[PDB]
Structures are given as structure tokens and as C-alpha cells.
């Protein structure tokens with residue numbers, strides 16, 4: 301009875317890039333297939349004078365040889381015909397870290413407390429998603445009141461992703 305087709309999902313109305321700038325702490329995530337950032341994750345968003353949005357990000361990750369390193373990453377965003385939907389190109393400061401190109405959607409935000417992000421890397425023949433990831437971000441690395449926790453859960457049900465996330469530690473391991 302629920303529609304899980306990716307083309308039917310509602311996104312943030314009248315999205316505002318300049319208002320989204322500044323520091324964002326990751327507090328929970330849903331993982332995709334393969335290598336991915338593990339914990340101690342912080343993001344910094346910026347917008348230039350001509351309207352182009354970009355970001356940096358740091359976090360610990362375990363490489364192919366299980367070595368434990370602090371990764372320093374960089375991303376740039378290209379606008380589309382929906383103001384909340386972007387294309388993101390990304391890479392690292394060290395040459396052995398991963399590079400690529402992903403969809404980046406803002407499902408909802410209030411700019412001053414919380415944000416919900418989503419990416420579908422592959423579509424099924426019937427229009428639902430075959431490989432996805434998602435981040436829950438905070439301005440304040442504290443818990444979220446009861447009423448904001450309830451709005452975050454309603455957005456996780458829209459995405460057909462209820463009960464598939466885990467909490468992330470913050471440890472000092474990276475700078």
C-alpha cells in the first residue's frame with residue numbers, strides 16, 4: 301500500500317543553500333555496499349559569491365589492509381531542475397583514498413537543529429532502490445528533544461528505511 305518508488309519521494313520545499321552553510325556533526329547512518337567512513341565524522345559546508353556550494357569532511361576509516369587512518373575528504377555540488385536535488389563529485393588529500401560521483405538529496409531540514417540526507421546509487425526494474433546510503437546530522441553534538449526525534453522517524457519511513465540505521469561515536473581520534 302506504501303509507495304517505495306524513488307520518483308514519488310517528497311523533498312524539502314524551496315531549499316536555501318546559504319542558510320545550510322557551517323558545521324554539521326554526524327550522529328547516525330545507513331550503510332551502502334563496500335568501503336565507507338566508520339566514525340568520528342564532521343562536515344563543513346560553504347557557498348561562494350556566485351552561488352556554488354562545496355564541503356570538506358574528516359573521519360576514521362579502515363583500509364583494505366585494516367590500517368586505521370584519519371581521512372581528509374573534499375566535495376563539489378552541481379544544481380538541477382529541483383532546488384533540493386544535486387550531483388556531488390568527491391576525492392581525498394592522500395592519493396590512496398576513494399574517488400567518485402553520487403546523487404545528494406535534502407529530504408528535510410530546519411537549518412538550525414537537524415537535517416536528513418539520502419543517495420540512491422542503483423535503481424531496480426520496478427522503480428524502487430537497490431543500493432542506498434543516508435546520514436542524520438546535528439548542529440549540537442547532543443541528543444535531540446522528543447519532538448524532533450519523532451519528525452526524523454517519519455522521514456525514515458517515507459524512504460522505506462525504518463529500523464535500518466546505527467549510532468556513531470565521537471572520540472577525539474581525528475583532529
Ligand SMILES: CC1=C(/C=C/C(C)=C/C=C/C(C)=C/CO)C(C)(C)CCC1
Nearest residue numbers: 335336343355357373374375390397398
Ligand atoms: C565528501 C562528502 C560526503 C561523502 C563522503 C564519502 C562518500 C567518503 C568516503 C570515503 C572513503 C570510502 C575512504 C576510503 O578510501 C558527505 C555525504 C558526508 C557530505 C560532505 C562531503
